[PDB]
């Protein structure tokens, strides 16, 4: 298995459970909105959150389909919410009156203006759902930018091998079924990677001072190893092999020695002898 | 004689312009209805 710059992956193996819960809550909000609009009760199955290079996601995307760009302040970049022909088909069939027992293929004909309007109607609902899912974890301002037909014209990422996250959704209304995805480049969520790795927390006030007090009260008494390095001499394997008792290895004048725990310096001091013991006359702790 | 005829025609036109002005100030919707009826009669 060789190494290539084409594998420009910040490979992720974490659960990303915060993304899962925000996705589920957005799905519930979208279900509520769709039940309000289409006068029918749908069900949204949130597919497993996917991580793949942009080229793989583009190839897996069923051409032709609807694509739409989002800007999410304060994060720089763009979201790539994609609506499949099946879902807009089902939406227009239910809005205009139908049963769906007579589906029609997609023949490459561009979406009619009425279909585009219905797409926008669902799109602002989905955008508000994503927003209200977001500010629970982090306030994000999501706003529609433009619509696109083919994926290759989106230019969502600088390179086709750029790693992206793809959240699918399977929306079913009766026997009618459709799917739609939300694609985000990984760079959109790099600064908040640790936030989305850990699950979200509900308490925000009581713990803020409760733990700030209790931790210093409890860890006030907890012993910890510390080691003082009095000298620092460089040698070689030759001298180590020939190292025999009775010789002297030179050391410069140690004016200050460092006391550290597991390596990280914690304080500096001056060595000395007190009551028949090797004592330290401390100066200050490194901040 | 023609000059006086034109002069009195102009004066009557101005005073009736004043009257139509004050009526349309009272109600421009009557003017709109008259205009709509005139286009209604136009196509026949």
């Amino acid at each position: 298995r060789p190494y290539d710059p084409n594998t420009q992956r910040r490979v992720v193996r974490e659960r990303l459970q915060a993304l899962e819960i925000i996705n589920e809550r957005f799905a519930r909000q979208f279900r509520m909105g769709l039940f309000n609009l289409l006068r029918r009760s749908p069900d949204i199955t949130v597919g497993a959150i996917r991580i793949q290079p942009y080229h793989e996601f583009a190839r897996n995307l069923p051409v032709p389909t609807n694509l739409n760009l989002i800007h999410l302040k304060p994060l720089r970049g763009t979201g790539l919410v994609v609506f499949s022909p099946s879902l807009v088909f089902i939406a227009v069939d239910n809005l205009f009156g139908g049963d769906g027992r007579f589906p029609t293929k997609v023949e490459g004909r561009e979406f009619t203006h009425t279909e585009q309007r219905v797409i926008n109607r669902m799109l602002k609902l989905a955008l508000e759902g994503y927003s209200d899912a977001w500010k629970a974890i982090n306030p994000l301002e999501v706003e529609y930018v433009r619509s696109e037909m083919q994926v290759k014209f989106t230019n969502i990422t600088t390179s086709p091998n750029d790693i992206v996250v793809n959240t699918p959704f399977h929306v079913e209304i009766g026997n009618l079924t459709g799917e739609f995805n939300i694609c985000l480049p990984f760079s959109m969520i790099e600064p908040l990677r640790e936030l989305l790795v850990n699950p979200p927390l509900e308490n925000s006030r009581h713990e803020d001072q409760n733990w700030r007090d209790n931790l210093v009260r409890q860890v006030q008494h907890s012993e910890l190893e510390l080691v003082a390095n009095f000298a620092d001499i460089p040698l070689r394997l030759s001298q180590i092999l020939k190292l025999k008792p009775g010789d002297v290895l030179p050391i410069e004048k140690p004016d200050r020695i460092i006391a550290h725990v597991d390596g990280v310096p914690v304080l500096t001091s001056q060595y000395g002898t007190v009551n028949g013991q090797y004592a330290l006359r401390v100066e200050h702790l490194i901040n | 004689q023609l000059q006086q005829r034109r002069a009195n025609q102009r004066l009557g036109a101005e005073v009736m312009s004043q009257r139509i002005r004050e009526m349309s100030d009272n109600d421009p919707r009557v003017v709109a209805l008259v205009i709509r009826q005139w286009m209604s009669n136009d196509h026949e």
Binding site: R39, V92, D93, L95, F96, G97, G98, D99, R101, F102, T104, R109, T112, H113, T114, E115, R117 | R6, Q9, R10, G12, A13, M16, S17, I20, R21, M23, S24, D25, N26, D27, P28, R29, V30, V31, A32, L33, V34, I35, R36, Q37, W38, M39, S40, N41, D42
Partner: protein, 328 residues
Amino acid sequence: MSNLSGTDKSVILLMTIGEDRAAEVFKHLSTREVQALSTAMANVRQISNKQLTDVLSEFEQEAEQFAALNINANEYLRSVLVKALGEERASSLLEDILETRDTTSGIETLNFMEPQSAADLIRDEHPQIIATILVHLKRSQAADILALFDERLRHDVMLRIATFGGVQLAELTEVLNGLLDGQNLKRSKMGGVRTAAEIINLMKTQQEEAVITAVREFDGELAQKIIDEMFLFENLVDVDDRSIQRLLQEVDSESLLIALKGAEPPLREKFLRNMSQRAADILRDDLANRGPVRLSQVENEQKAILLIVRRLAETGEMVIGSGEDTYV
């Protein structure tokens, strides 16, 4: 004292009442009404003293019948209803009535013009929206639009209608609004089939034959469509005898005699059986006696006969609807 149309009288009133006066007049007028009005002064003639006097006297006599001291209906109704039923109820009722008026106006407007225009307007639409637009319209216009789609689209629409399940009114009103805006498309079609067929009909025999050969070399099917639309002059061989006799009641004997010199002998034989026996004998004797005629004169007479046929068919007297169809 030139006759003054209603547009002229309205213009005379409008540029006399005032600027904000005209603005508030259009505030209570339809957009197409304002467009038709604005189309006038761009090329209107300067009004005359007696003309303005007469039009404004007509305005006065209509005014005697039109005097109610009315306030604007929408805002007055809103002001009354916000107190009668509350702001939210007033808004809901106002928008409901507005949407009902919008859909009624759209349906009435769509039930007024020639079918193929609306057919091509809604051809690109999704079949489901076509279905609900089709049902809510007038049945006669419904079938007229129906008879123009292809097999698959029309069959799908009928399946949807046979399996219809109710339609929301508000989005339907929005659909009529959208297609109304689609109608407001400043485009000139000028289809290159019927107009092309007429043009080829207008040309001389050599030119039209050369063009037909060239286009058939380019595309035989398109040439066949053009000739099936224009029929040229020789198509009189396939015209019903009743139409031929109706034509002979108006054609000139000398013109027909000149034209028949260049006509095909089968065409002459078919034609000579249509007029009266004495007229047919006179025509045959004239053809025998008359010598050769210039091809230009014969072509001119044939073109005149074709033009006569075209104008008489415009009145609907002649039945030249793409051949003799099927005999029953």
